[PDB]
Ligand SMILES: Cc1cc2nc3c(=O)[nH]c(=O)nc-3n(C[C@H](O)[C@H](O)[C@H](O)COP(=O)(O)OP(=O)(O)OC[C@H]3O[C@@H](n4cnc5c(N)ncnc54)[C@H](O)[C@@H]3O)c2cc1C
């Protein structure tokens with residue numbers, strides 16, 4: 001029930017009262033802590049400034065234009081080969097194998113690699129991806 | 132509402148009986164509640180009858196007259212109540228007209244040391260009770276610490292100048308009997324710093340609450356947290372105040388640290404984000420070069436090369452989108468950095484100047500309690516607040532000396548007569564005194580009782596100025612040493628004319644240092660004439676008494692010139708300067724509950740001393756040395772109404788003894 005605008009706890013009292021100089025010691029230690037924090041603030045601010053100077057220019061220039069492709073469902077021989085390779089590299093990021101094929105969706109890829117099981121030894125390709 | 136109001140004026144609960152009524156009417160309190168109500172009504176009604184016309188004596192006959200049934204039955208009851216209220220000074224006290232001319236057959240003899248309000252009240256009451264009373268005063272005047280300077284049509288109180296409310300104040304009655312004009316006071320105390328420039332309203336009001344809040348905080352630190360002893364030694368109000376201030380400054384500091392720590396956290400999290408973004412960037416650079424080297428293999432290509440091109444395309448797009456996400460987060464963090472950088476917590480608790488003004492407020496508190504706050508008990512300094520009177524605090528415009536003088540009419544005061552030794556035995560008492568003008572003229576007054584109204588400062592004197600034979604017991608001397616006697620001073624400045632704002636009654640001055648917060652800290656106007664009173668309080672008082680008059684008056688005129696202009700202060704016509712701690716007959720100002728004492732010490736100092744048996748094996752003697760004064764009343768200390776209440780009480784006690 002202390003007053004409003006006043007902050008008084010048992011512990012803090014006992015701390016500031018325990019010694020004849022405890023008050024000034026506590027206060028001036030906190031004082032020092034504050035300087036320390038703000039020294040490190042300035043440190044890190046200069047660090048991050050340097051890093052941001054590095055990132056000047058963003059990534060705009062090695063971006064590649066986006067293209068849309070209507071998702072067909074007829075697997076072309078070329079698309080099947082692309083898919084086998086994309087498995088060997090991306091394993092089971094089939095979103096990504098759809099991305100590389102470009103003209104397939106994630107469910108059509110997922111099908112494919114039951115569709116063709118035996119025929120493209122896809123099990124073995126995956127095994128190889130895992131080493 | 133009227134009888135109950137009579138109970139209220141007389142500081143008595145209207146709906147129950149007090150301990151003194153239980154001791155003088157043990158049969159009524161101990162029996163049926165109805166009869167208790169009857170008694171209470173007779174009490175309140177007799178008191179109302181007295182209070183409605185305090186300038187005439189109230190006789191049992193008139194009381195019964197003006198009573199009705201069923202309360203006009205038990206005539207013995209009414210007579211008993213009247214006698215009780217008259218012996219203890221609740222009715223027929225002060226300056227009234229006697230309807231029953233006293234008797235020349237006087238019983239008993241009492242010597243009252245001191246002709247202040249306490250002694251004068253006790254003497255008037257004992258004379259009305261039928262005793263022979265002689266007062267022995269050292270000064271050339273009556274009143275004591277009620278002193279009024281009067282030169283020409285300049286009048287200014289040098290001691291008491293105020294009535295701390297008229298709701299329940301005995302002085303109210305006296306004011307009707309003496310025709311003393313009371314005048315209100317106006318809140319407004321415009322504060323002015325050393326530069327002479329007023330304090331802006333908004334810092335003034337700030338600091339004024341910070342003061343009230345810090346005081347409430349000392350109270351909380353005492354009553355809930357029990358911080359009343361430290362270093363095996365009792366805590367003062369000033370020690371608690373400084374502890375509280377230190378903890379508030381600590382709070383500023385810690386909040387501060389936490390703000391900057393949030394800033395560091397967010398900063399370094401930005402660090403990791405940016406750091407990852409630099410790496411991701413070089414990686415995107417390399418992957419783009421690879422995509423370009425693969426997409427420049429001509430369009431006639433096997434499927435492994437087409438796969439290279441398209442796989443590098445996908446990988447590039449993925450890493451670029453990841454970079455864009457990290458870049459959104461960069462902004463959602465910079466945003467909070469500049470939010471927090473832009474809401475800084477407070478820098479300080481109290482600026483230097485803010486603190487000077489807080490010192491002014493502390494000095495006001497030191498003035499009203501007449502002692503450095505380092506001397507007051509954190510636990511019992513405000514023990515008299517529960518008994519404060521209701522209403523607005525008032526001033527005495529004609530000179531409050533009007534009261535003591537009027538109370539000295541028809542009494543046997545021996546002025547210029549200073550007591551050197553008080554002797555008390557089981558047969559009587561002997562007061563030895565001298566002439567203040569010729570110390571060699573010695574006087575011996577023999578008595579049945581002595582009433583000591585000597586100030587606590589005189590009783591504290593070592594080497595003693597008044598010797599008690601036999602020596603006073605230890606349970607009294609230790610109380611005398613424990614209780615505090617303070618000091619406050621005034622500078623009366625009479626002038627050509629008003630150069631201040633007639634619409635303001637108080638205006639203040641903020642001091643440069645905490646040690647000088649009492650040095651001429653308030654100037655006060657309250658009279659018809661062009662008079663200003665400059666008040667000295669706290670540790671300043673005791674020091675200012677070793678500075679010449681002219682130097683004090685010059686400091687006063689200097690601040691007044693800095694405030695109103697060097698061309699608006701005339702040089703003062705008449706100047707007076709108080710020095711109460713040096714007064715050999717006061718030794719200070721008024722009492723204060725000091726660290727290490729309590730209100731029980733007041734009561735102890737009010738307890739009568741009973742001699743020992745002269746012949747061994749003789750019946751227990753009767754008490755002989757009685758004490759009164761402002762240092763003897765617990766619920767109303769260091770006030771004129773307290774001194775009058777003490778005198779009435781001791782008169783009642785002495786009469787209960789020697790008159791029955
Ligand atoms: C500056 C100041 C202002 C105050 N203003 C107020 C105020 O406005 N209102 C208020 O309620 N209270 C006020 N107080 C307190 C109040 O004035 C006193 O409590 C009270 O009036 C004194 O009561 P008293 O009769 O017991 O003491 P005193 O009036 O001092 O009675 C003791 C008497 O004994 C005499 N005496 C001393 N030594 C000897 C001796 N050896 N032999 C013989 N006689 C001796 C003294 O001269 C004195 O006349 C003020 C106090 C101070 C210091």
Ligand SMILES: Cc1ccc(-c2ncc(OC[C@@H]3CCNC3)cc2-c2ccc(C#N)cc2)cc1
Pocket residue numbers: 290291292293295316498499500515524637721722723768769770
């Ligand atoms: C404007 C103003 C109004 C009231 C008070 C005050 N207010 C309270 C109080 O209390 C008495 C204390 C209580 C504890 N024991 C004695 C005393 C005083 C007081 C009054 C007049 C003088 C003089 N000249 C000195 C002090 C001051 C200024």
